[PDB]
Symmetry: C2
Subunit: 285 residues, 2 copies
């Protein structure tokens, strides 16, 4: 039922972090050229990430997925995307049952189906040691570190690795924060790897946290799952919120659970099917 | 109804969701907004709806909705995309035909599979036709100190919609959003004026950025390109056939004589076919 010259796809999003999902089983990977075209919001389809679904690699998983950014390069992990792959897998008959595993580029992740739209994904175990983030110029683990980013920009932040590095800055109001400017400053500070994602968090209660994230490469999007998990863990590590907490992002709301310091952070949230598509003249770019 | 077939197209990066409305209701404001949402919907500058023709001449009409669900009286790049759509659907057979827009009837020449020349409108420079306020009896280059401290020298023309055309030394560094909004709020024009920032490279070539009503800048504004060309032709600065380079692509503009329609040649592209799932 696949017309030659065309590429079927599914447009999805997880809390406004949006994806072009391809079924890559028994065929090639998309070239970088094709990924770039797919992600072009005006002349292509438009998305934060291209996700390609294949047969499982691990013994237990029901499907595997790979990830491409809007410039065509591969990416090692994605938070919101995993929920969309899970929903897509359920819809395609790949994944039956309340619980199943998915292979990402970097690991195998257990998924719980909470309802048709809601999926819970184990992401990673937070690492706080300055040595594992790495947090340069710091040796003792601390709840908060302090950065002099030049006169007029003094920043107090927490630090944690979720596979990717994260700086978490508490704010009076997130809608409000110099996300792009301070996020770029922290990224260029040399306190972290240049890949650090900078979150700006406002604690509404022990149950509810508001967050914006300046992400490496993309900059800010509507939702950064890794950053949400990082903000939650940091605020839990310092006793500010409960071990189950809602994180409110521009594009949607997630529920983060971290039952034990040695356990994986769990990320619950929505997955949405937006439209089905057929990209024309897929060989002509 | 349940799901909704659509076609995604663009004209020089000005992008559209095209619906076939020939026997169904118009998209609601709510549907238009969901359709235009780039992250949680389809994503487009405008929604276009194909309808049966109104004029004796045309093979099809089309209506236009903005990303907030309100209707729009015309669109230059969209017309080329409607032309391509109409050819593909078998509505228009040979290399020329007419299309009804919400505000007129437009001759289309099919130059090749992806290239269409469309007659936009006859330029009107009379201050009372723009309408120009405060002036409204004066036809020349104008100068005005806007309410935001900027002094601007600009030409005025109506292509159906109003246009202010400002010459600059460099389109890349021009204050398109700031001065474009200043001009719209000025009261020299209806708030609906599109504000162009044009650098003349040669008599054959013009670079342009346009601050549009409502949307702000996009990758291409066809009516703005026609307005900038007609202004610079009346000002004697360019030939009656001129290329207008926009952020998303290039258009070829011709205005054979002062009573003629301005003709706008440029690309139209099909990107993908889609089924919107509502749910």
């Amino acid at each position: 039922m696949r017309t030659p010259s065309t590429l079927p796809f599914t447009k999805m999003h997880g809390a406004g972090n949006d994806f072009v999902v391809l079924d890559l089983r028994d065929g090639p990977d998309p070239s970088p050229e094709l990924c770039r075209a797919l992600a072009d919001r005006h002349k292509g389809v438009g998305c934060d990430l291209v996700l390609g679904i294949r047969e499982p690699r691990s013994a237990r998983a029901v499907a595997a997925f790979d990830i491409w950014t809007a410039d065509g390069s591969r990416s090692a992990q994605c938070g919101n995307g995993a929920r969309c792959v899970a929903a897509w897998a359920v819809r395609a008959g790949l994944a039956r049952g309340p619980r199943f595993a998915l292979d990402s580029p970097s690991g195998t992740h257990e998924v719980d189906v909470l309802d048709a739209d809601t999926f819970r994904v184990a992401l990673a175990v937070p690492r706080f040691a300055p040595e594992s983030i790495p947090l340069f110029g710091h040796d003792g683990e601390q709840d908060l570190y302090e950065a002099d980013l030049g006169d007029g920009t003094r920043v107090r932040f927490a630090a944690v690795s979720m596979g990717n590095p994260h700086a978490v800055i508490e704010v009076d109001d997130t809608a409000t924060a110099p996300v792009a400017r301070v996020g770029r400053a922290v990224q260029a500070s040399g306190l972290f790897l240049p890949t650090v994602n900078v979150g700006f968090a406002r604690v509404e209660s022990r149950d509810r946290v508001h967050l914006r994230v300046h992400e490496y490469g993309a900059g800010e999007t509507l939702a950064c799952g890794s950053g949400a998990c990082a903000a939650a863990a940091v605020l839990m590590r310092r006793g500010r919120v409960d071990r189950n907490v809602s994180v409110v992002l521009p594009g949607g709301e997630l529920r983060i659970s971290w039952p034990d310091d040695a356990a994986d952070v769990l990320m619950t949230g929505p997955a949405a099917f937006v439209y089905e598509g057929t990209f024309l003249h897929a060989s002509v770019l």
